């Protein structure tokens, strides 16, 4: 009676969750934009009415792809650069005591060593100023990386400044964006759009503080794969950035040493003037109000009358125990002890100063046997950034105590990329469909 | 009421629109299905998109629906696949809902369409012989 027959429809708007390789689009840098398609001046966003999709920031393959691409670009930016194999020599080091502060005693080592020249049968006695973290005593010292692997000097002209990158899908694939404010990264998103690709995401490498990132539109956002599991990192996104001013005030001097044919090693000659610790400044009132907002948002998950305590990092490598980042070529590791130090009970122009240590021997990603040497930067360096989020970890959390402890965390840059790709997913279009209709061939 | 013609909703704007309303924008989705280490992944992605498009086109051709966006077939609709009438399909559902419902009755229909197209080709060859 029905008299129904199969009918094939092509171009149906149906998609399935899929994993594919996205490509870079952008408007000397480590993040190579010369191999990226130009970004369209007028990107098109199609707002899908009535479409409710499923999103999960913690299983997004986009984060893994971004991590892999960033690591690949970092590796490729270092291939055509000098390998400092000859630098692994015995170093005769003395203390730098000329115009140093009480907090810089023993932090800089004036190390003299023999070095190769452009002629294979000649040697030159040179000297350089190394950092205490970069050398280990064997008055005789050696570079920290010597017993692990040789370090590749970063090419001086290549710039470390993050550049925005757009990740766009191939033909037949669509990037779905969740426009729902207050969205916590997991679950059903009712307000959805299709975009050729995302906003420009800057690959900022940082620990314990998300820098130069996107801000929440409505309020501070707390996100976790499993909030009740203390082993899962908590991503906090701010709605108002906190200005942080980080400076190395030493007037560094760079000198070139010819270590071979067409091979130059950039040493730190002599600091011009007083030697004092690099540091960072954060507004006290702004940080206090931001922590109050974070406490308010955390009370929604951990009870209305719980005590919220911010404490120091538990321990581990210098990368994770300190706010590690790069500011104008130099690699800062800042002791964020004045920030996460407070207790909150349910009920001026001064600023917090975070001391920082500079490092030249860098293991940017969590790898062993692949190290990079940062050439010294000429002159004082000062830079200003927005703290837009935090990577926290809950300490224990047994039923014995009603107090919740949160400590800074990080190390894995996948969390940093997840904070920007949380509202994005990739799907593959299934244009073919079959339906019943009265029509017959 | 009065009207001022049709409108354009975008690449997947009709995803939330009903199946009858979503069938009005087939060409919009159809048009966009085609368009030293990173020169390989890009080429792999382009090749994969080409293969998927050609697989879809080959299926449509071997079903006798070459060059058609809406194609009637001679295969009857077995009631086991779906017992819903037209009133609650084309005006009260989306193509995504139909896909989630019918995704487990797909390959059998494809094989039936292929065999039916082959039978039609043989029958047409026999008819033209007279």
């Amino acid at each position, epitope marked *: 009676a029905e008299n129904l027959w199969v009918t094939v429809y092509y171009g149906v708007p149906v998609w399935k969750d899929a994993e594919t390789t996205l490509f870079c689009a952008s408007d000397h840098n480590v993040w190579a934009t010369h191999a990226c398609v130009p970004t369209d001046p007028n990107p098109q966003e199609i707002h899908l009415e009535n479409v409710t999709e499923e999103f999960n920031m913690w299983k997004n393959n986009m984060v893994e792809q971004m991590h892999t691409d960033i690591i690949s670009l970092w590796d490729q930016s270092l291939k055509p650069c000098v390998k400092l194999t000859p630098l692994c020599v015995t170093l005769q080091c003395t203390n730098v005591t000329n115009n140093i502060t009480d907090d810089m005693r023993g932090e800089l080592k004036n190390c003299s060593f023999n070095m190769t020249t452009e002629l294979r049968d000649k040697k030159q006695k040179v000297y350089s100023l190394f950092y205490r973290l970069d050398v280990v005593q064997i008055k005789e010292y050696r570079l920290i990386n010597c017993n692990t692997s040789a370090c590749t000097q970063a090419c001086p002209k290549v710039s470390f400044e993050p550049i925005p990158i757009h990740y766009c899908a191939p033909a037949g694939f669509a990037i779905l964006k969740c426009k729902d404010k207050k969205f916590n990264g997991t679950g059903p998103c009712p307000s959805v759009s299709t975009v050729q690709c995302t906003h420009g995401i800057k690959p900022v490498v940082s620990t314990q503080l998300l820098l130069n990132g996107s801000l929440a539109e409505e309020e501070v956002m707390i996100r976790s794969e499993n909030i009740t599991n203390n082993a899962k990192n908590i991503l906090v996104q701010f709605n108002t950035p906190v200005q942080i001013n980080c400076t190395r005030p030493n007037n560094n001097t760079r000198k070139s040493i010819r270590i071979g044919p067409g091979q130059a090693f950039y040493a730190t000659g002599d600091i011009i003037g007083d030697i004092r610790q690099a540091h960072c400044n954060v507004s006290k009132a702004t940080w206090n109000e931001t922590l109050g907002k974070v406490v308010k948002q955390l009370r929604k998950h951990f009870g209305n009358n719980t005590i919220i305590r911010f404490a120091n990092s538990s321990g581990g490598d210098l990368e994770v125990t300190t706010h590690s980042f790069n500011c104008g070529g130099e690699f800062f590791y800042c002791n964020t002890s004045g920030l996460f130090n407070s207790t909150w009970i349910s009920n001026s122009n001064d600023s917090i100063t975070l001391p920082c240590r500079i490092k030249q021997i860098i293991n940017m990603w969590q790898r062993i046997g692949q190290c990079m040497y940062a050439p010294p930067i000429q002159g004082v360096i000062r830079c200003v950034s927005n703290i837009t989020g935090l990577i926290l970890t809950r300490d224990g959390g047994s039923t014995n105590s009603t107090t919740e402890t949160f400590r800074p965390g990080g190390g894995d840059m996948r969390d940093n990329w997840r904070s920007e790709l949380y509202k994005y997913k990739v799907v593959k279009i299934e244009p073919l469909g079959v339906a019943p209709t009265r029509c017959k061939r | *009421a*009065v009207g001022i013609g049709a409108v354009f909703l975008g690449f997947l704007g009709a995803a939330g629109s009903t199946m009858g309303a979503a069938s009005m924008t087939l060409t919009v989705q159809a048009r966009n299905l085609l368009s030293t280490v990173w020169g390989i992944k890009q080429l792999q992605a382009r090749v994969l998109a080409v293969e998927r498009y050609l697989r879809d086109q080959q299926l449509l051709g071997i079903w006798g629906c070459s060059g058609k966006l809406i194609c009637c077939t001679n295969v009857p609709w077995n009631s086991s696949w779906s017992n819903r009438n037209l009133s609650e399909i084309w005006d009260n559902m989306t193509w995504l809902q139909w896909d989630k419902e019918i995704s487990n009755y797909t390959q059998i229909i494809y094989g039936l369409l292929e065999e039916s197209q082959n039978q039609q080709e043989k029958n047409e060859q026999d008819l033209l012989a007279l």
Partner: antibody
Amino acid sequence: QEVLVQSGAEVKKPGASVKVSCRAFGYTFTGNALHWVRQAPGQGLEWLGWINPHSGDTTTSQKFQGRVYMTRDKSINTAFLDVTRLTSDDTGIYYCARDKYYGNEAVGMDVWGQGTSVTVSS
Amino acid sequence: DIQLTQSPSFLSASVGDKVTITCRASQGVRNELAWYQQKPGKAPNLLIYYASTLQSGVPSRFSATGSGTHFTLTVSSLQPEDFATYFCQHMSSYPLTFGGGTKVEIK
């Protein structure tokens, strides 16, 4: 998330021409018919006309024919309303509104712009 | 042009009462009427479309009935935010026109 933003207030002399812009965010600009309406101070609303942002087709009230024109730019998602030969009766608040436009016909004016005040006086 | 007459022109009622506004059309309008609410110094908002369907995000107290030439907008329980101007607008034939306007004020 659907919002319509128009140009600022305008003051003009009689017999001049005025342009009113209306840009859209939060939805596909070519997906809904756009109405242009006016309201005089202390009076009711009066429907100037409407336009199809996709095909560019326009329909104007018969009393306004030959005096008010409508255009749209898709590259930057805006509708322009040109009102020429203004008089002291044309003073008021002009609004651009998105239509629900179900079934490709007028249904309701769900999203409204914040409006622009046009003042005509010697 | 089609004339839409709205009654009462002015109305005073207290919170918790019931208010009915009648919009009458000179010609026939099957279901192509919309009810709009406008406040001082603000653009109107869509209360009802199709003369019987409540706009999404509107409180359930609002309701509409009637087809053809007679239409009625009913607010069962008034609230302090419901005291403002109400319009009825038809779209069956050109030119579209709005109602004269009914202003509701707290007593």
